[PDB]
Design an enzyme around this catalytic site. Structure first.
Site, PDB file in Angstrom:
ATOM      1  N   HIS A 753     -17.878 -98.372  58.923  1.00 56.52           N
ATOM      2  CA  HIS A 753     -16.953 -98.042  59.902  1.00 56.52           C
ATOM      3  C   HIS A 753     -16.673 -96.257  59.475  1.00 56.52           C
ATOM      4  O   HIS A 753     -16.088 -96.299  58.334  1.00 56.52           O
ATOM      5  CB  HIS A 753     -15.700 -98.630  59.834  1.00 56.52           C
ATOM      6  CG  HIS A 753     -15.893 -99.984  60.178  1.00 56.52           C
ATOM      7  ND1 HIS A 753     -16.088-100.171  61.587  1.00 56.52           N
ATOM      8  CD2 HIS A 753     -15.879-101.281  59.641  1.00 56.52           C
ATOM      9  CE1 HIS A 753     -16.324-101.833  61.773  1.00 56.52           C
ATOM     10  NE2 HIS A 753     -16.041-102.227  60.654  1.00 56.52           N
ATOM     11  N   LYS A 762      -8.024-107.433  63.008  1.00 57.85           N
ATOM     12  CA  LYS A 762      -8.367-108.680  63.546  1.00 57.85           C
ATOM     13  C   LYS A 762      -7.386-109.720  63.665  1.00 57.85           C
ATOM     14  O   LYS A 762      -7.709-110.830  64.283  1.00 57.85           O
ATOM     15  CB  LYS A 762      -9.440-109.073  62.694  1.00 57.85           C
ATOM     16  CG  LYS A 762     -10.827-108.131  62.496  1.00 57.85           C
ATOM     17  CD  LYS A 762     -11.950-108.941  62.099  1.00 57.85           C
ATOM     18  CE  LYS A 762     -12.127-108.935  60.489  1.00 57.85           C
ATOM     19  NZ  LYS A 762     -13.617-109.497  60.171  1.00 57.85           N
ATOM     20  N   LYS A 779     -20.003-101.678  54.377  1.00 59.90           N
ATOM     21  CA  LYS A 779     -20.397-103.175  53.905  1.00 59.90           C
ATOM     22  C   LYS A 779     -20.866-103.448  52.551  1.00 59.90           C
ATOM     23  O   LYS A 779     -22.098-102.570  52.622  1.00 59.90           O
ATOM     24  CB  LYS A 779     -20.798-104.017  54.916  1.00 59.90           C
ATOM     25  CG  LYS A 779     -20.645-105.357  54.772  1.00 59.90           C
ATOM     26  CD  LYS A 779     -21.438-106.357  55.751  1.00 59.90           C
ATOM     27  CE  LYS A 779     -21.272-107.820  55.539  1.00 59.90           C
ATOM     28  NZ  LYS A 779     -21.811-108.650  56.214  1.00 59.90           N
ATOM     29  N   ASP A 826      -4.618-135.846  52.549  1.00 60.44           N
ATOM     30  CA  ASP A 826      -5.590-136.565  53.371  1.00 60.44           C
ATOM     31  C   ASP A 826      -6.498-135.641  53.939  1.00 60.44           C
ATOM     32  O   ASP A 826      -6.528-134.632  54.312  1.00 60.44           O
ATOM     33  CB  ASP A 826      -4.665-137.134  54.505  1.00 60.44           C
ATOM     34  CG  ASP A 826      -5.333-138.413  55.380  1.00 60.44           C
ATOM     35  OD1 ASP A 826      -5.863-139.204  54.444  1.00 60.44           O
ATOM     36  OD2 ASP A 826      -5.643-138.001  56.608  1.00 60.44           O
ATOM     37  N   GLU A 919      -7.211-139.115  47.845  1.00 57.99           N
ATOM     38  CA  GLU A 919      -7.653-140.218  48.691  1.00 57.99           C
ATOM     39  C   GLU A 919      -8.878-140.267  48.045  1.00 57.99           C
ATOM     40  O   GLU A 919      -9.764-139.392  47.802  1.00 57.99           O
ATOM     41  CB  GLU A 919      -7.606-139.755  50.385  1.00 57.99           C
ATOM     42  CG  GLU A 919      -8.640-140.872  50.783  1.00 57.99           C
ATOM     43  CD  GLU A 919      -8.647-140.464  52.315  1.00 57.99           C
ATOM     44  OE1 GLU A 919      -8.060-139.442  52.711  1.00 57.99           O
ATOM     45  OE2 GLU A 919      -9.403-141.274  53.356  1.00 57.99           O
ATOM     46  N   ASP A1168      -3.152-138.554  61.411  1.00 59.31           N
ATOM     47  CA  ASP A1168      -3.803-137.946  60.267  1.00 59.31           C
ATOM     48  C   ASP A1168      -2.327-137.812  59.302  1.00 59.31           C
ATOM     49  O   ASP A1168      -2.351-138.117  58.186  1.00 59.31           O
ATOM     50  CB  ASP A1168      -4.350-136.753  60.339  1.00 59.31           C
ATOM     51  CG  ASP A1168      -5.825-136.912  60.545  1.00 59.31           C
ATOM     52  OD1 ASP A1168      -6.289-138.096  60.556  1.00 59.31           O
ATOM     53  OD2 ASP A1168      -6.581-135.931  60.860  1.00 59.31           O
TER      54      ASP A1168
HETATM   55 LI   LIG Z   1     -16.184-106.086  60.882  1.00 54.19          LI
END
Ligand SMILES: [Li+]
Ligand SMILES: [Li+]
Length: 1214
Positions: A753, A762, A779, A826, A919, A1168
């Site tokens: 970016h 986001k 990244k 659960d 459980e 549930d």
């Molecule tokens: Li992204």
RNA sequence: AAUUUCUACUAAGUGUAGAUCGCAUCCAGUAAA
DNA sequence: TTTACTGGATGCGTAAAGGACG
DNA sequence: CGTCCTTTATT
């Protein structure tokens, strides 16, 4: 005051903290110029190579011993193992025989000539080189001559094999606890399955498998167990069972095969044999690595000059000359892929299957039937055993003047011309000059070019595949098929290149490979004591809040040794670390050494005391002899300046000591000290300048000048290592390691970016939809330049003072807690996890799905729907592999979700002082996508047990209860998996039976078997009801039953229930497949349909008078659906409702749907929520049992609740 | 969409939140061709 | 058979005595 | 012979 508040300082545990290590000054330039990293990189390769040379030797040492052993008392051990009922007289004789059986094996190993030197310098320097007679291998081993100490760890792993103890790693454990027990499990099968073995089949194995040297039954007699100690003997034994294939490729069958052939023809199932496990250390197309490899692979195997291209050009002429061959001798194979072939020639998919039947039905469907469903069965099945279709069959399917043989001429040529038009699009890949601008995995443009080519070649190849026809067909035109198989056998070569290239391109782009660094020191950075800085050549400095790893070059070990300055204001501080590690070994090591035993001449009474162990517990224990030992050790610790000056010991009076451990604890608790001394920063920064010292900043993001949040848990532990308020609760340990992780990516290839452009945020709930930064955001930046990794072990709670059995203490506190809360957790197919918190009276306090993790930041609310993230990537791999992008791994997204969950669970534990109810998970995971719900659930369990070993609240003052120094310890040490069962501290493992399909208001469950079975049985069902009537006041049909009139209903407590036809239910089809019934109209319509009048009161006699079985089948279908309290659908996200056929004390039926709406429901909100709630309530039950018991009997109280007690509980606590 | 590392993030900007026991070895295994 | 990936089970998480050594 | 690698001790 709280229950948690008791569980601090209970036991020691060890953790490793990881940090980036950043070079400072000319460190990396000096490291580079001295080529130090290159040496270590190679050492890492040589090391893995030299260990495989050692194991070659260790394996030879193991074998000759285990080939020459006869284990004694074999028959007796088997005889006692093989008892119906075993009394205590030989229980203790047998385990002594089992312990003695293993010692026999171990004592064999130590007896051999080399056991002394196997794990010492000698194995590297002379023994291994003599064993190998290759000169290259001796060269490789001898490059460790100065370094054998580097093998110390590896040698410890190899000592584990020769132990006599009962651990997985021991050889004696593999033979005695594992291989022998299946050898005898096999013995008792063989004498029970022996009859079913034919005379020759036994001699088949005799000759093919057994050498004709041994009988098959020999391997089922005790005294031949010794044959099977070695891997060679295990490989023979397992062939008698599973068989083996002759090198010719025809299959010799084993006894397990004969068993299954018999198991099929006689209707009953015989037991099968277990195969033996392998013996320890037996050493019982690979993917392209570099970008250039892949590229030259691609170029030279798919270009126009290659053979694959010749094979396509050859196959092309064949199809163009398709009518110089016999149409009766060319065959197209029959698969589901045929329908692709059908439409290519005829213009639609099922011309070929339709015309096969019209001719097939022609004489083979009888005129009667015309179209009975009988025919669907076998006209669908007679289609799929037909193995091929001749081109003469296909042309009889055609009408004039469609010539199938010219259509296939045109389809392939249009298909070969596309491969050629893709070769133009790709020709720039084939050049000699072609240079890759970017790495292949991040080069989406160049990979897209290969896939277009490998796809078109694959489209054509899989098309040609059809024309083989699996024959094995009576009159193939072997003119055509002769050249065809040649061209096709080469065309098949693309299927490896296709998969090998795709596997390279879809590997994760970055790597985490790294190698250990030694800085030319075989015991590098082994410890932290001040005495050994020069021996280990590594130490820790700090400049204010920033810490450094300081490493001494091999030529200047003392370069840090005499440095001091009077003011720290311009200076570093060097750690002063002193550790006396393990008094139990260190105090005898020193005081009985050749160096000092003379100095403090121990009484011959002491030496006799110590040799015989009168100071340890058991038979030879003598309390005054232990005190007389302590006084010698006590007095000798003074007059040892190295210990006495470092630690100012303050012991208890020796009379007050109960066992030697009481003394060693005080020595171990006080034998550790950390402090800092000054060090001139000028006179150290120059050592780095000159290359005599290397300095790295110990770093993670929390040490950044731009960092402002709460720190990482592990930065807190690291920092507290040197805080004055750390009074020993966290120790810095020896055994640190430095690693170099080479870069795996380049910055210019990383996803960016770029600065000053807006990046979308986001979370849609935040009205700040954008963020605009002045710097690039990459990244995987961390993998784009070289990185040093420092791994630092710490020791938590090394001297625990609060010693008790955790499970017992949890029960005591639960017995005396007026209001103990429970968190029920659960597992749902519908919900990854559901949570209910109840108080001590079963009142629901909280209930919600943990599908969405909701988080708090500065007024920001964010919900992260982990449920739909998880399914997205689950099919992404299966679907997106075709996309040909990089491998997604789902294990880390689940671990991510689990860590969000674990934080939430512990916050509930602390808020409510609450135990956990978990459980039990079904061992079998049934279709489909089974680890989606059991992977998150089993990983949630391990992760949660972990955190509760040392549970820290990062917000507490570190020395407060629950702070980093006083973490909570509410699970037992996670030493094994099963040593804990049913409870581990605050965690209770409780079975799930009738936790979901039960009425929470009443405890009602369905114990009736309502599958329609016979015409007769349906009237014994109706007459076992006490009454069946219509209640016009409620528009309901009542069914008064007493469960005692039905089979398998013992567990129920109430027995007498009145069921009603209240509300809707949901039905499913067996061949939208589900439909939804409203009960009272089905009973009304069914009674009208068959002439029964419901309003005629007790209608049991009336129902049984019916004569048509359709009434009984559709009536039990309603007595199956009225009893179905849980309603939801395969895949159905939408409706999960729980509705009951029974009224409660206040005359009301139960809908979860009545509760799903409200914000604070006192009852479960869906099936549930109900399951979690009942798992919680079953633990409440156990707490009730604790409260009825007496403290001294709490440990033996059974908390695994039976179906009888559960139903009694659920039916009576309302 | 940054990290000791993993997950989810990006409110005034090189980061936020929670999680994170490493190394070595042995052994069972499951998926694919 | 081969490759990959994942599951639990063992050991170490050390200063100091002991020794070789060119 | 003082430096550096190896081996020791076991609640
Ligand atoms: Li992204
Ligand atoms: Li943070």
């Amino acid at each position: 005051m709280s229950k948690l508040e008791k569980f601090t300082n209970c036991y020691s545990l060890s953790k490793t903290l990881r940090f980036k290590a950043i070079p400072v000054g000319k460190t990396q330039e000096n490291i580079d110029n001295k080529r130090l990293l290159v040496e270590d990189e190679k050492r890492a390769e040589d090391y893995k190579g030299v260990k495989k040379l050692l194991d070659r030797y260790y394996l030879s040492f193991i074998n000759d011993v285990l080939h020459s052993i006869k284990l004694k008392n074999l028959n007796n051990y088997i005889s006692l193992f093989r008892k119906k009922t075993r009394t205590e007289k030989e229980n203790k004789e047998l385990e002594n025989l089992e312990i003695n059986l293993r010692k026999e094996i171990a004592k064999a190993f130590k007896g051999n000539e080399g056991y002394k030197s196997l794990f010492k310098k000698d194995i590297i320097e002379t023994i291994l080189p003599e064993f190998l007679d290759d000169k290259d291998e001796i060269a490789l081993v001898n490059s460790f001559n100065g370094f054998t100490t580097a093998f110390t760890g590896f040698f410890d792993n190899r000592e584990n094999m020769f132990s006599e103890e009962a651990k997985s790693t021991s050889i004696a454990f593999r033979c005695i606890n594992e291989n022998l027990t299946r050898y005898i499990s096999n013995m008792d099968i063989f004498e029970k399955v022996d009859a079913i073995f034919d005379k020759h089949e036994v001699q088949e194995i005799k000759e093919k498998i057994l050498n004709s040297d041994y009988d098959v039954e020999d391997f089922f007699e005790g005294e031949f167990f010794n044959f099977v100690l070695t891997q060679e003997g295990i490989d023979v034994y397992n062939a008698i069972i599973g068989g083996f294939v002759t090198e010719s490729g025809e299959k010799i069958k084993g006894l397990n095969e004969y068993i299954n052939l018999y198991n099929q023809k006689t209707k009953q199932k015989l037991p099968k044999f277990k195969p033996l496990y392998k013996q320890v250390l037996s050493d019982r197309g690979e993917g392209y690595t570099s970008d250039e490899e892949v590229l030259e692979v691609f170029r030279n195997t798919l270009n126009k000059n290659s053979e694959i291209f010749s094979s396509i050009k050859k196959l092309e002429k064949l199809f163009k000359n398709f009518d110089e061959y016999s149409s009766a001798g060319i065959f197209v194979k029959n698969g589901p892929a045929i329908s692709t072939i059908s439409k290519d020639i005829f213009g639609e998919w099922n011309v070929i299957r339709d015309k096969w039947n019209a001719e097939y039905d022609d004489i083979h469907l009888k005129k009667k039937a015309v179209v009975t469903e009988k025919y669907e069965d076998d006209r669908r099945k007679s289609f799929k055993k037909i193995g091929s279709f001749s081109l003469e069959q296909l042309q009889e399917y055609a009408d004039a003047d469609l010539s199938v043989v010219e259509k296939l001429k045109e389809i392939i040529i249009q298909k070969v011309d596309e491969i050629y038009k893709v070769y133009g699009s790709s020709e720039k890949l084939f050049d000699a000059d072609f240079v890759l601008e970017k790495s292949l995995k991040k080069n989406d443009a160049v990979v897209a070019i290969m896939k277009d080519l490998l796809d078109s070649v694959k489209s054509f190849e899989n098309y040609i595949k059809a024309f083989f026809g699996e024959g094995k067909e009576t009159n193939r035109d072997e003119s055509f098929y002769g050249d065809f198989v040649l061209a096709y056998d080469i065309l098949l070569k693309v299927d490896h290149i296709y998969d090998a290239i795709r596997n390279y391109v879809t590997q994760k782009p970055y790597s985490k490979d790294k190698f250990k660094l030694y800085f030319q020191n075989p015991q590098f950075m082994g410890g932290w004591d001040k005495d050994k800085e020069t021996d280990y050549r590594a130490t820790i400095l700090r400049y204010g809040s920033k810490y450094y790893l300081a490493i001494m070059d091999k030529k200047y070990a003392k370069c840090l040794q005499k440095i001091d300055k009077d003011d720290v204001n311009g200076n570093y501080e060097k750690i002063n670390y002193k550790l006396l590690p393990g008094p139990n070994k260190m105090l005898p090591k020193v005081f009985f050494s050749k160096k000092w035993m003379a100095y403090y001449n121990p009484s011959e009474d002491i030496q006799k005391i110590y040799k015989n162990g009168t100071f340890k517990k058991g038979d030879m224990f003598n309390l005054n002899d232990c005190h007389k030992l302590i006084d010698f050790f006590k007095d000798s610790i003074s007059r040892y300046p190295k210990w006495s000056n470092a630690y100012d010991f303050n012991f208890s009076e020796t009379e007050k000591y109960k066992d030697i451990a009481g003394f060693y604890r005080e020595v171990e608790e006080q034998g550790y000290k950390v402090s800092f001394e000054s060090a001139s920063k000028k006179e150290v920064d120059k050592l780095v300048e000159e290359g005599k010292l290397y300095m790295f900043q110990i770093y993670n993001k929390d040490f950044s000048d731009k960092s402002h949040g709460t720190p990482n848990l592990h930065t807190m532990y690291f920092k507290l290592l040197f805080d004055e308020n750390n009074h020993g609760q966290i120790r810095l340990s020896g055994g640190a390691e430095l690693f170099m992780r080479r870069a795996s990516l380049k910055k210019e290839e990383l996803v960016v970016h770029p600065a000053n452009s807006p990046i979308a945020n986001k979370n849609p709930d935040n009205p700040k939809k954008t963020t605009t930064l002045s710097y690039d955001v990459y990244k995987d930046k961390r993998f784009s330049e070289d990185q040093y990794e420092l791994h630092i072990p710490i020791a938590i709670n090394k001297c625990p003072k609060n010693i008790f059995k955790i499970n017992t203490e949890v029960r005591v506190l639960l017995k005396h807690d007026d209001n103990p809360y429970v968190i029920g957790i659960d597992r749902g197919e519908r919900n990854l996890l559901y949570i209910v918190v109840v108080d001590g009276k079963g009142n629901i306090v909280e209930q919600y799905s943990l599908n969405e993790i909701i988080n708090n930041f500065n007024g920001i609310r964010i919900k992260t729907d982990y449920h739909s993230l998880l399914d997205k990537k689950e099919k992404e791999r299966f679907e997106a592999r075709q996309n040909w992008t990089s491998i997604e791994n789902i294990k880390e997204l689940k671990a991510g979700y689990i860590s969000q969950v674990v934080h939430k669970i512990c916050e509930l534990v602390e808020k409510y002082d609450a135990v956990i109810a978990l459980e039990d998970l079904n061992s079998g995971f049934k279709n489909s996508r089974v680890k989606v719900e059991k992977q998150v659930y089993q990983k949630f369990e391990k992760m949660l047990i972990d955190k509760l070993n040392y549970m820290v609240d990062k917000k507490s003052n570190p020395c407060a209860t629950g702070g980093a120094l006083k973490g909570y310890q509410i699970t037992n040490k996670f030493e094994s998996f099963k040593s804990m069962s049913t409870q581990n501290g605050f965690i209770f493992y409780i079975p799930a039976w009738l936790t979901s399909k039960i009425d929470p208001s009443t405890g009602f469950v369905n114990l009736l078997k309502t599958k329609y079975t016979s015409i007769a049985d349906s009237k014994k069902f109706i007459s076992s009801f006490d009454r069946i009537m219509y209640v016009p006041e409620e528009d309901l049909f009542e069914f008064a039953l007493d469960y005692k009139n039905f089979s398998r209903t013992d567990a129920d407590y109430i027995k007498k229930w009145k069921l009603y036809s209240y509300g809707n239910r949901i039905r499913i089809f067996r061949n939208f497949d589900w439909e939804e019934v409203c009960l009272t109209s089905a009973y009304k319509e069914l009674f009208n349909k068959y002439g029964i009048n419901y309003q005629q009161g007790d209608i049991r006699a009336l129902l049984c008078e019916q004569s048509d079985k359709a009434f009984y089948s559709s009536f039990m279908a309603l007595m199956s659906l009225m009893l179905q309290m849980r309603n939801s659908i395969t895949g159905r996200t939408d409706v999960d409702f729980l509705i009951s056929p029974v009224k409660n004390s206040d005359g009301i039926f139960y809908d979860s749907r009545n509760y799903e709406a409200q914000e604070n429901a006192i009852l479960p909100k869906n099936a549930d929520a109900n399951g979690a709630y009942n798992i919680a309530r079953k633990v409440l039950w156990a707490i009730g049992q604790f409260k009825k018991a007496e403290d001294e009997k709490l440990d033996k109280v059974k908390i695994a609740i039976s179906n009888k007690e559960w139903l009694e509980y659920a039916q009576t606590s309302v």
